[PDB]
Amino acid sequence: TFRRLWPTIAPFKAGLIVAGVALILNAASDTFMLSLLKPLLDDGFGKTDRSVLVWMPLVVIGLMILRGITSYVSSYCISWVSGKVVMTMRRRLFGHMMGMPVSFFDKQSTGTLLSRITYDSEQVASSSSGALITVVREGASIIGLFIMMFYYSWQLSIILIVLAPIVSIAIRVVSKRFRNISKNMQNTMGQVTTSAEQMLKGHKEVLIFGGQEVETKRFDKVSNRMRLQGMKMVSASSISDPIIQLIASLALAFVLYAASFPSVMDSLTAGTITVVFSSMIALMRPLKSLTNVNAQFQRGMAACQTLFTILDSEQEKDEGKRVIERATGDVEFRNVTFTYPGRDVPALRNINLKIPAGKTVALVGRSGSGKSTIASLITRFYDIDEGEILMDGHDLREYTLASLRNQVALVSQNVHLFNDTVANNIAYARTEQYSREQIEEAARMAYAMDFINKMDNGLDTVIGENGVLLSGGQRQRIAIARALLRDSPILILDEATSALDTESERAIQAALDELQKNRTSLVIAHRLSTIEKADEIVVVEDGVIVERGTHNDLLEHRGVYAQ
Amino acid sequence: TFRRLWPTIAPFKAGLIVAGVALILNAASDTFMLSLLKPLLDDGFGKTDRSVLVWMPLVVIGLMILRGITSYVSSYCISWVSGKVVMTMRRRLFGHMMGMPVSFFDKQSTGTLLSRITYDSEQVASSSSGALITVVREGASIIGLFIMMFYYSWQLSIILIVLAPIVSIAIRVVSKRFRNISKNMQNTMGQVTTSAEQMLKGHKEVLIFGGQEVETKRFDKVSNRMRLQGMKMVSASSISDPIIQLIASLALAFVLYAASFPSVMDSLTAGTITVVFSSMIALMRPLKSLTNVNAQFQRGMAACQTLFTILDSEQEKDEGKRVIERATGDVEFRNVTFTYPGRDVPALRNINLKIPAGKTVALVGRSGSGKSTIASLITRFYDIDEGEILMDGHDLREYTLASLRNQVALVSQNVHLFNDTVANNIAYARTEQYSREQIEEAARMAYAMDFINKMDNGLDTVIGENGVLLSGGQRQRIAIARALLRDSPILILDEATSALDTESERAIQAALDELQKNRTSLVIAHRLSTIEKADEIVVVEDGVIVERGTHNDLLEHRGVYAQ
Ligand SMILES: CCCCCCCCCCCCCCCCCC(=O)OC[C@H](COP(=O)(O)OCCN)OC(=O)CCCCCCCCCCCCCCCCC
């Protein structure tokens, strides 16, 4: 439905009427130029008069100055409406996927929704504004070329106004045929493209098992299947326009044969028969464009109703009303059982896990099928199915989501770096209240500044993409710095260090023990240093915990934790 | 570049002459139709004949049956040439891409290199065949129209052959301006889509730090920078064609004003004035295309030199002549040191590692330092820098590389499945010598067959992409069946199935222990049962050997065996 999209375009109505009257005036500029062919052959090369050939080059430049200006104005004042509309409805998309849950981002829709901001909204504004250019402009061309034809010779224009529905019907059925094989072939193109992607993706096993002559013989059958499909693109799209221009020229022959009729027709001068038989050649592109506009507008509305799936999608549930000033209370799981959205296997059994205030709790393992999931549930990235993760005596759903996520603070080696200054990157969404003094003391407290003070601009450098691209261990260091300035009683650590950097690890672990000196830390473990610094060690195997306690009690009976 | 591409198009040369003589006949069919306006305005309507006006409709259709036929013939016999040249250039890319090293596929060129098969190999012959349609057709239109003007009015055609270089120069400089702005803007379009991508990959750690109103104040400054950049296309792509058709209309008005002179007029009849003023309107699309063919042919040959580097890159080095029928000898690492291509840190330091025949060398190390690296070195995926790995008494280089990889078979649940039959997936690269009795017995030895006994078609179903999409465990078990039938003397198992499965592992472990009861089997260890079953455990951590010996000696001296 177009009526959903119209309140977006409704503020920019003036550009649609200024260019709307600059498309009628553009199509009444080549119409009044084909109407100059009557007083050129009748009055300049019929009756000999040089006078019409004196001002005729002047109006020929005049109508082309008008046509050029009116073509620039209409293609700027529509592409300002169709630029501001896509700007508005893609910055409304972005404001609706910054509140839509992580499970929506977690492989329900991948990073290709970048293309659903950049391409799928430009295609709406370029197929609904290109379907107004060929409705106003070619509609005014059809209207104006059927006035000057009716003014000069009504006898041929009656035949033409009969025949032009027949030529439009022919254009519709011939274009609908190509639209049938194309949208049917689309699937075999997808199959034949993934069939060549798959063999290239298995390159290593191709070289190992020795099928560099079998896979060659299989690429002699899929490339031959791409060739024999690309030749059916051109056996269907290049039979279309020869058929269209032959049915259309049958109208060019019927009007020409009807102009041989002795008395009812053939009272037409040379200029009149030049105007009628040159407007007909100029009637072919208005007839082609006005017949295929509904297959262009419904390529814009088919993407607009694709974009509005997101605009009516459910955002993240902020169904809580209480605000946490500081989470001094200890967060504790209570009968919590969780299942991943989009899957049926549960990643969390019925588990009570207490994280005491000021005491770190380790998560020792590699995958666990639930280790990073447990870290995600405290931040409420994925909403809980049943159970209650009690936070200061109340469940997470009781609190407002922004104040809930203010208490938690993840730290990762794969942390995100914005295209901002490192002063604002340290203090994201806290630039106004938290001044530069707190930022520089917190950067010095985490021992970050030894890298920052030696940079090109100090605390003004751009770190992210199209930036200086700071180090992998410096990503965790800048995550310590963002974890600093406090107001974060809960810390989430992964430690993806792997290869420890020499002489920077001595400051990284110093800042890490500064991070874990107080406050309710929950760390997942790949380093035995964080393991022996842990207080209550938690180990999850195959999505469940059985064994808990400190390192000594888990060292008394080995199980799978010790080795 | 075209002199290197012409040996590929030279077998398909008969389609380029049939279409090349159909494009000329197509361009000489609308020229002979604009030559039908002289004996229609003079001999038809000027001198009232009625004999002219009945044969004229039959040549209106007579030159559109010809125009349609030669528009279909020349667009089927060039898209058969530019389908077969694409097919040959795809089969030759692929044959020079299953012999390339893995280091080419490893981060030197990612999964978009399939585009070089699909899009880029199509782009070269959709821009070198479209630059021949333009040269032959619109260069035969210019020739044809410029025969027709000099036949009909030589006075109003010397002016044309003066002005059409000036219009051609104008089109060239105006289109060069648009190409300059576009190829300059390209970088800023990439910058703004990157700066929109990076906010969207980081949805998490925006909700955490609270920046859901800072992020929509930065998208208000990049979506306002894609808007103002689309408005610089439409202020540069929409000022081009008005300027072009105003400069051309200046030439049209100069020719119209020159036809008012008594030297030029009184030799122009009422039909001659129509032909040299309707073929000039039909001279615009030949003049616009023939000054932009070099901006098309140099986008095809510049898309031909991004694929003739892959056709000129060095393949993987088979600089060996010895063949191994069966390698019962011990694989001995002798002073082997290896660094990754594209990086400077060594992923494998100076290492001596004994792999005994029939004994399992479990790599109990972790964190991705040198296990998957050494599993690639034994197969000679990436060639060695210094040192020598000795395979039955000689280095891998001395051997032919195909037999060297025939000795070794990787086993993984990350192994690739092809879109062939299951029996041919078990007997890949050898299905004619290896009969189906051996395939059935080897699938029975791997305990997988029952699942394929309950599949849809027995040992005949398609299993790859657009297939049944088998389980992760049965993928590892069908790799077991493959390595069982192929009888590889040296085994490399990765053990990606740390999370075991009920009812599958009872046969998976039996098949695994059946397979590694023999063979020089190096195994990457992540499951403690294979660690217990191992003979000589070798630890690798951050590039170097830590401990060597059985697990009891590693129990006596702990080190990182427990870690
Ligand atoms: C999706 C598929 C598309 C298929 C497309 C098919 C196209 C078929 C044709 C459609 C357009 C037909 C337009 C007909 C216009 C006729 C105008 C006319 O006859 O006016 C000429 C007339 C002069 O005639 P004459 O008497 O010879 O001259 C002597 C001068 N005193 O007088 C004049 O000089 C001027 C008189 C002005 C009259 C204006 C008429 C406007 C017509 C508007 C039609 C709207 C189209 C549909 C929109 C629906 C809106 C609800």
Instruction: Give the C-alpha separation, A496 to A253, whole Å.
Output: 78
C-alpha pair distances (Å), B102 with each of A207, B109, B177, B340, B369: 9, 10, 43, 11, 18
The two tokens of residue A54 are 């004196």
Pairing label, strands A536-538, A361-364:
parallel
With 0-12 / 13-18 / 19 or more C-beta atoms within 10 angstroms meaning exposed / middle / buried, residue B433 is exposed
For chains A and B, CB pairs below 8 A equal: 356
CA of B273 to the centre of ligand 1 (A): 30
Q: For a pocket test of ligand 1, which of A135, A142, A147 has the largest count of ligand atoms closer than 8 A to its C-beta?
A: A147
Experimental determination approach used: cryo-EM
Amino acid identity at A109: S
Instruction: Give the C-alpha separation, A526 to B560, whole Å.
Output: 12
Instruction: Give the C-alpha separation, A15 to A8, whole Å.
Output: 13
Pairing label, strands B354-355, A490-493:
unpaired
Percent helix, strand, coil in chain B (nearest 5)?
50, 10, 40
Of A215, A203, A211, A189, which is closest to residue B91 (Cα–Cα)?
Answer: A215
Dihedral Cα B452, B453, B458, B464, nearest 10 deg: -10
Helices (H) and strands (E) in chain A, counts: 27, 8
Instruction: Give the C-alpha separation, A540 to A531, whole Å.
Output: 14
For ligand 1, atom 43: residue with the closest CA: A143
CB atoms under 10 Å from CB of B336, counted, come to 21
User: Residues with Cβ < 8 Å from B265, sequence gap 6 or more?
Assistant: A45, A48, A50, A53, B259
The domain made up of B331-556 has a fold known as Rossmann fold (3.40.50)
Measured from the CB, is residue A168 less than 6 Å from ligand 1?
yes
Euclidean distance between the first and the last CA atom of chain B, given in angstroms as a whole number: 59
Instruction: Give the C-alpha separation, B59 to B52, whole Å.
Output: 11
DSSP readout, A136-167?
HHHHHHHHHHHHHHHHH-HHHHHHHHHHHHHH
DSSP-assigned letter for residue B504: T
- Cα A161 from chain centroid? 45
Instruction: Give the C-alpha separation, A164 to A168, whole Å.
Output: 6
CB atoms under 10 Å from CB of B160, counted, come to 21
Are A217 and A206 in contact by the 8 Å Cβ rule? The answer is no
User: Residues with Cβ < 8 Å from A454, sequence gap 6 or more?
Assistant: none
Domain B1-151+293-315: CATH superfamily, name plus number: ABC transporter type 1, transmembrane domain (1.20.1560.10)
Instruction: Give the C-alpha separation, B67 to B444, whole Å.
Output: 66
DSSP readout, A302-360?
HHHHHHHHHHTS--------B--S---SPPEEEEEEEE-TT-SSEEEEEE--B--TT--
Question: For residue A388, what are the β-bridge partners?
Answer: A334
Instruction: Give the C-alpha separation, A381 to A408, whole Å.
Output: 12
With 0-12 / 13-18 / 19 or more C-beta atoms within 10 angstroms meaning exposed / middle / buried, residue A552 is exposed
The two tokens of residue B280 are 């000039």
The two tokens of residue A496 are 């993806």
Are A148 and A31 in contact by the 8 Å Cβ rule? The answer is yes
Are B274 and B38 in contact by the 8 Å Cβ rule? The answer is yes
DSSP-assigned letter for residue A520: E
Instruction: Give the C-alpha separation, B432 to B429, whole Å.
Output: 9
Are B248 and A53 in contact by the 8 Å Cβ rule? The answer is no
Of B314, B442, B316, B464, which is closest to residue B379 (Cα–Cα)?
Answer: B316
Nearest by CB to residue A231, choosing from B71, B83, B94, is B83
Q: Residue A170: enclosing H or E segment and its boundaries?
A: helix A154-201
Of A32, A365, A553, A21, which is closest to residue B498 (Cα–Cα)?
Answer: A365
Is residue A390 helix, strand or coil? strand
Are A349 and A333 in contact by the 8 Å Cβ rule? The answer is no
Write B281-287 long-range contacts (CB < 8 A, 24+): B282/B30, B282/B34, B282/B141, B282/B145, B283/B141, B283/B142, B283/B145, B283/B160, B283/B164, B284/B245, B284/B248, B285/B138, B285/B141, B286/B138, B286/B139, B286/B141, B286/B142, B286/B145, B287/B142, B287/B164, B287/B167, B287/B168, B287/B171, B287/B248
Are A408 and A379 in contact by the 8 Å Cβ rule? The answer is yes
Instruction: Give the C-alpha separation, A372 to B296, whole Å.
Output: 52
Helix axes of B436-445 and B472-486: crossing angle, nearest 10 degrees: 130
CA of A168 to the centre of ligand 1 (A): 17
Residue contact B207–A405, C-beta within 8 A: yes
The two tokens of residue A425 are 């990157």
Interface residue of A206, A209, A487 to substitute, partner B, most B CBs within 10 Å? A209
Question: For residue A538, what are the β-bridge partners?
Answer: A363
> Taking CA atoms, what residue in A is nearest to B345?
A499
Instruction: Give the C-alpha separation, A249 to A220, whole Å.
Output: 43
CA of A28 to the centre of ligand 1 (A): 13
Place of tokens 């280089």: B397
Q: Residue A410: enclosing H or E segment and its boundaries?
A: strand A408-411
Pairing label, strands B537-541, B386-391:
unpaired
Residue A114 zone, left/alpha/beta (φ > 0; ψ -120 to 50; rest):
alpha
Of B491, B492, B317, which is closest to residue B395 (Cα–Cα)?
Answer: B317
Of A493, A331, A516, A520, which is closest to residue A410 (Cα–Cα)?
Answer: A493
Amino acid identity at B555: L
Nearest by CB to residue B61, choosing from A234, A249, A415, is A249
User: Residues with Cβ < 8 Å from A391, sequence gap 6 or more?
Assistant: A324, A327, A329, A331, A399, A404, A407
Q: Residue B387: enclosing H or E segment and its boundaries?
A: strand B386-391
Write A484-488 long-range contacts (CB < 8 A, 24+): A484/A426, A484/A442, A484/A443, A484/A445, A484/A446, A484/A515, A485/A426, A485/A427, A485/A430, A485/A434, A485/A438, A485/A439, A485/A442, A487/A326, A487/A406, A487/A407, A488/A406, A488/A407, A488/A408, A488/A409, A488/A519
Instruction: Give the C-alpha separation, A354 to A389, whole Å.
Output: 10
Helices (H) and strands (E) in chain B, counts: 26, 11
With 0-12 / 13-18 / 19 or more C-beta atoms within 10 angstroms meaning exposed / middle / buried, residue B74 is buried
Amino acid identity at B318: D
Amino acid identity at B526: H
Are A102 and A382 in contact by the 8 Å Cβ rule? The answer is yes
Instruction: Give the C-alpha separation, B139 to B164, whole Å.
Output: 13
Instruction: Give the C-alpha separation, B527 to A159, whole Å.
Output: 85
Q: Return the half-sphere exposure (C-beta side, CA atoms, 13 A cut-off) of residue B354.
A: 11
C-alpha pair distances (Å), A279 with each of A147, A274, A524: 11, 8, 77
Q: Return the half-sphere exposure (C-beta side, CA atoms, 13 A cut-off) of residue B228.
A: 8
Q: What is the 3-state secondary structure (H, E, C) of A222-239?
A: HHHHHHHHHHHHCCCCCC
For ligand 1, atom 18: residue with the closest CA: A147
Q: Residue A202, annotated ligand binder?
A: no
Place of tokens 């604002």: A424
* B80 backbone dihedrals φ, ψ, rounded to 5°: -90, -35
Are B78 and B30 in contact by the 8 Å Cβ rule? The answer is no
Amino acid identity at B347: A
Amino acid identity at B44: G
Pairing label, strands A408-411, B354-355:
unpaired
The two tokens of residue A308 are 């509005």
> Taking CA atoms, what residue in A is nearest to B87?
A223
Instruction: Give the C-alpha separation, A146 to A157, whole Å.
Output: 7
- Give residue limits of the domains in chain B: 1-151+293-315, 154-267, 331-556
Instruction: Give the C-alpha separation, B560 to B563, whole Å.
Output: 5
User: Residues with Cβ < 8 Å from B561, sequence gap 6 or more?
Assistant: A563, B364, B537, B539, B547, B551, B554, B555
Instruction: Give the C-alpha separation, B275 to B283, whole Å.
Output: 12
User: Residues with Cβ < 8 Å from B374, sequence gap 6 or more?
Assistant: B348, B353, B363, B522, B540
- Cα A238 from chain centroid? 33
C-alpha pair distances (Å), B388 with each of B322, B333, B398, B406, B540: 16, 6, 11, 20, 19
Of A209, A384, A388, A401, which is closest to residue A322 (Cα–Cα)?
Answer: A401
Q: Residue B365, annotated ligand binder?
A: yes
* B410 backbone dihedrals φ, ψ, rounded to 5°: -65, 145
For ligand 1, atom 28: residue with the closest CA: A151
The two tokens of residue B221 are 């400054």
Measured from the CB, is residue A164 less than 6 Å from ligand 1?
yes
Are B391 and B399 in contact by the 8 Å Cβ rule? The answer is yes
Are B488 and B408 in contact by the 8 Å Cβ rule? The answer is yes
Are B178 and B237 in contact by the 8 Å Cβ rule? The answer is yes
Q: Return the half-sphere exposure (C-beta side, CA atoms, 13 A cut-off) of residue A351.
A: 25
Write B245-250 long-range contacts (CB < 8 A, 24+): B245/A64, B245/A67, B245/A68, B245/B284, B246/A61, B246/A64, B246/A65, B246/A68, B247/B166, B247/B167, B247/B170, B248/B167, B248/B170, B248/B284, B248/B287, B249/A60, B249/A61, B249/A64, B250/A61
Q: Kindly report the CATH number that applies to the domain delimited by A332-556.
A: 3.40.50.300
The domain made up of A1-153+292-315 has a fold known as ABC transporter transmembrane region fold (1.20.1560)
DSSP readout, B513-563?
HHHTTSSEEEEE--SHHHHHH-SSEEEEETTEEEEEE-HHHHHHS-TTS--
Instruction: Give the C-alpha separation, A528 to A526, whole Å.
Output: 7
Amino acid identity at B234: V
DSSP readout, B217-278?
HHHHHHHHHHHHHHHHHTTTSSSHHHHHHHHHHHHHHHHHHHTTSTTTTTS--TTHHHHHHH
Across A157-226, the runs of DSSP E, i.e. the strands, are: none
CA of A140 to the centre of ligand 1 (A): 10
Residue B549 zone, left/alpha/beta (φ > 0; ψ -120 to 50; rest):
left
Place of tokens 């992020």: B215
Residue contact B199–A69, C-beta within 8 A: no
Instruction: Give the C-alpha separation, A137 to A75, whole Å.
Output: 11
Are A86 and A304 in contact by the 8 Å Cβ rule? The answer is no
Place of tokens 């000696």: B553
Are A156 and A39 in contact by the 8 Å Cβ rule? The answer is no
Q: Which residues of B touch A41 (CB under 8 A)?
A: 41, 270, 273-274
User: Residues with Cβ < 8 Å from A432, sequence gap 6 or more?
Assistant: none
For ligand 1, atom 39: residue with the closest CA: A147
CA of A143 to the centre of ligand 1 (A): 6
